[PDB]
Paper text:
Crystals of EcDHFR complexed with [name] and UCP1228 diffracted to 2.1 Å and 1.9 Å, and crystallized in the occluded conformation with the Met20 loop occupying the NADPH binding site. Like TMP, the PLA binding mode is dictated through hydrogen bonding with Asp27EcDHFR or Glu28DfrA1/DfrA5, and the propargyl linker forms π–π interactions with Phe31. However, unlike TMP, the bicyclic moiety forms van der Waals contacts with helix C (residues 43–50). Interestingly, the [name] had a distinctly stabilizing effect across all three enzymes, agreeing well with our crystal structures where a racemic mixture of this ligand is likely adopting different binding poses for an optimal configuration.
Expectedly, all three enzymes form the stereotypical DHFR fold with an eight-stranded β-sheet, four α-helices (B, C, E, and F) and three catalytic loops (the Met20, F-G, and G-H loops).
Author numbering:
A (entry chain A), B (entry chain A): 1 to 161
Amino acid sequence: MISLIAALAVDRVIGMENAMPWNLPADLAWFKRNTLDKPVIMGRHTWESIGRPLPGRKNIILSSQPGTDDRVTWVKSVDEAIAACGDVPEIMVIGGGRVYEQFLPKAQKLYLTHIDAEVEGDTHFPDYEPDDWESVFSEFHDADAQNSHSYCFEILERRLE
Amino acid sequence: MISLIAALAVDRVIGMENAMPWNLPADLAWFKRNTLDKPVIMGRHTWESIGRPLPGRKNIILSSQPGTDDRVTWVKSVDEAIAACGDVPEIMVIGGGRVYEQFLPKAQKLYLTHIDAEVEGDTHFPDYEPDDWESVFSEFHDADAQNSHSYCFEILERRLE
Ligand SMILES: CCc1nc(N)nc(N)c1C#C[C@H](C)c1cc2c(c(-c3ccc(CN)cc3)c1)OCO2
Ligand SMILES: CCc1nc(N)nc(N)c1C#C[C@H](C)c1cc2c(c(-c3ccc(CN)cc3)c1)OCO2
């Protein structure tokens, strides 16, 4: 199945990891832990930010533009992106805002990092209906030496019921 | 012992409950639950906001001004406020910003509600040193019908070690 994983500031603002507070080391280790050995789907700007593939897994870029790097797989539609992952237990959609919006209908699981911080931003995570999603896990953490703000991991699963 | 209980928006902004998002019904029930049958200490503006005593417990107002309501106890110093609670297991300090600051050194426990919302505000909860406080409990909640933002209860205890 298809999962979205995203780090969210207040009012569900999202942004690229190079900047602060998305540079919470704890979130980076959470992200690595939940995408390890799974295929990842991302949009072109996310691919541009990261600059090179995430290791040891299929990296798929969803884009209307022809590909410019042969280390990853380029596709033009959502169904092409899904089919390119093959038969696997879980597909991870890792951003950005437009890709989250396209994949949210088919997604069955969300891995959210709620970061207790203010950031100015244009792009928000999709507005998932609280009614169709069941929170099944949450884990709060205080700000500490390495992490500049408090943050809460959460996992939700679609109430297909 | 002395405990501070407070609802905090991002960057530790605090405000009176009449306004939103401090009007999270879930926080109100959390507040009632943790102050029931305990003496409460508050500053004059908090007393002014609430307009009448919290029922079934000693209400102490810390203020440099002479009292104007005989249903509560008025005192002028922190030690007077503590002594007026008598011999009890737990004293609850319920605001506002100046009272939290005065009582934080003697406090041994914090009940914090982290509300995932933006509010403009002048007054912040005191900047407790993460080093002297151990988080011993946290419980995250999604926004729902009755609660307009997500929120996380947390309890910390002083590392007097
Ligand atoms: C972790 C963030 C993060 N947290 C959560 N919860 N969900 C997410 N979907 C992402 C993300 C992201 C995108 C793909 C992104 C964007 C980037 C990145 C990186 C990056 C990732 C791993 C490593 C390993 N060293 C280095 C960089 C990643 O680097 C510059 O822009
Ligand atoms: C609950 C907020 C709240 N949450 C948390 N975590 N910590 C807190 N220290 C307070 C608070 C507060 C102050 C005392 C306050 C200020 C107010 C209040 C009320 C009020 C309280 C109970 C009831 C019962 N119906 C009604 C009103 C309370 O009403 C107008 O201004």
